[PDB]
Amino acid sequence: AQRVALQLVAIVKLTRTALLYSDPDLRRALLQDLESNEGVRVYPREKTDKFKLQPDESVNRLIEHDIRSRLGDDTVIAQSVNDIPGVWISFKIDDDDYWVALDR
Amino acid sequence: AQRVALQLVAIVKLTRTALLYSDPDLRRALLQDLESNEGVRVYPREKTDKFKLQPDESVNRLIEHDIRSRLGDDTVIAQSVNDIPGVWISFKIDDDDYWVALDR
Ligand SMILES: [Ba+2]
Ligand SMILES: [Ba+2]
Ligand SMILES: [Ba+2]
Ligand SMILES: [Ba+2]
Ligand SMILES: [Ba+2]
Ligand SMILES: [Ba+2]
Ligand SMILES: [Ba+2]
Numbered sequence A, B: 001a002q003r004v005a006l007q008l009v010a011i012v013k014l015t016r017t018a019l020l021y022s023d024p025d026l027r028r029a030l031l032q033d034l035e036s037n038e039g040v041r042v043y044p045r046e047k048t049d050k051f052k053l054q055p056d057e058s059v060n061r062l063i064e065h066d067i068r069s070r071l072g073d074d075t076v077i078a079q080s081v082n083d084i085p086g087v088w089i090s091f092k093i094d095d096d097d098y099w100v101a102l103d104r
């Protein structure tokens, strides 16, 4: 529980941080780097993006509990967004909502 | 071996990325965020910074092998730099050398 959640939290936080402090002119280039080089796909999150939860198997819900405690109670953790499989974790910068998608 | 190394690689890569694409005016502020919020201390690496290897115990050398395969053959991995304990991993942006220090 704790260990997996800690790693996922670290990834989301470092990714959000990279975006937060990014040179606005290089922000699109940064998103390409994160995806290709770090395997981290960032997307804007639209209010109408649909999602499906990870199953209640193994320690998923405990992992999810620990992630929200560290990232924020309103964090969405999902196994798909708009029918696209992955490990999906939402985050925010100010008024802007985002997804991070990782490979399962 | 693989798993620990993969996580450390991810941290170093995301950290380097954040720095690489950072707004130059916010770069010092970014370093504060990484340290306080992500527990990642970045330092410039000076050619005369001394270091001490992690012991050859457990799977340390295998972890180190996997880290270098992903980050670069010239990567230094150390248990201390200038007598300061931690998990230290070097990285570069162009001509500039850096350390990342994590808690053990
Ligand atoms: Ba909290
Ligand atoms: Ba919003
Ligand atoms: Ba809002
Ligand atoms: Ba809202
Ligand atoms: Ba919004
Ligand atoms: Ba290589
Ligand atoms: Ba140099």
Ligand SMILES: [Ba+2]
Binding pocket: B094, B095, B096
């Ligand atoms: Ba050099």
Ligand SMILES: [Ba+2]
Binding pocket: none
């Ligand atoms: Ba050199």
Ligand SMILES: [Ba+2]
Binding pocket: B095, B096, B097
């Ligand atoms: Ba140098």
Ligand SMILES: [Cl-]
Binding pocket: A027, A028
């Ligand atoms: Cl953008």
Ligand SMILES: [Cl-]
Binding pocket: A050, A051, A052, A080, A081, A082, A083, A084
């Ligand atoms: Cl979905």
Ligand SMILES: [Cl-]
Binding pocket: B027, B028
């Ligand atoms: Cl600087």
Ligand SMILES: [Cl-]
Binding pocket: B050, B051, B052, B080, B081, B082, B083, B084
């Ligand atoms: Cl040392």
